[PDB]
Amino acid sequence: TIWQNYIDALFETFPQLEISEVWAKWDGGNGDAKLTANIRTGEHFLKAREAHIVDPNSDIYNTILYPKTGADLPCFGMDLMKFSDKKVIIVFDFQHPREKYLFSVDGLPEDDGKYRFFEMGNHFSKNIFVRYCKPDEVDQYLDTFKLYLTKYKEMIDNNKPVGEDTTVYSDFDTYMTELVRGYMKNKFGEGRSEAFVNDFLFSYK
Known part of the structure; x- marks a missing residue:
């Protein structure tokens, strides 16, 4: 996968998130499409749910970390999507569970508002990070991704949330x-x- 360095960075920052269930392995497409769906669990988190789909023209890594509850922490979500032979969109953000709550993190880039991709302040933060690039280029944004991970680890570690109320994420x-x-x-x-x-992507509804 073209996303290996992102995946490695994620689990270097959060080595506690170990696979607790391989939820699905599916073939699809012409099968030439392969999907892997894992649930990971570990200290401070309700779950990390990781989807990884590859086919001859795509490579999609879609993962959200859901922290334990009661500390009013956001999820950390990413949609790293090679969607054609020559095109990728990268999205990652701190996604707060509370509707219409505007969240931000000091020391991270703020979206300039030139492009309207996602609803700012409604499960997306001031620091929403969206970029298009070639598959050949995806690691240009790895250093920035690692900075986001550093800030998320700080807030997780500072708060040590223990709540298990999945309805927080409904x-x-x-x-x-x-x-x-x-x-x-x-x-x-x-x-x-x-x-x-x-049953896998958004199962806390």
Whole structure:
């Protein structure tokens, strides 16, 4: 995968997040598409849920860390998406569970507001990070990603949250579910795509 350095950085920062379930291994596409879905658990987190899909023209790593509750911490989410042979979109952010709550982190870049990608202040922070690039270029943004990870580890470590109330994340998982799902439908079928979104991606609704 073109995302190996991101994945390595994520689990260097959070070595406690160990695979607790391999939720799915699926073939799809022409199968020439392979999907891996893992649930990871470990100190300070309810779960990290990691989706990784590859085919001849795509490489998608979609992962959200859901911290334990009661410290009002955000999730950390990323959608690292090679979607064609020559194109990638990279998105990562601190995604707060509370609707309409504006979050930010001192010392991180702030989006300039030139492009309207996501609803700022509603499960996306001032520091939303969105870039398009070539597959050949994806590590240009690795250093910035590592800085985000450093700030997230600091807030997790400072707070040591212990709550296990998954309903904290209901509004967030509903919102993300509502946010065509063309890729998944085309490759794995309408049924498996629906199960993937509801039972794995956003299962706290």
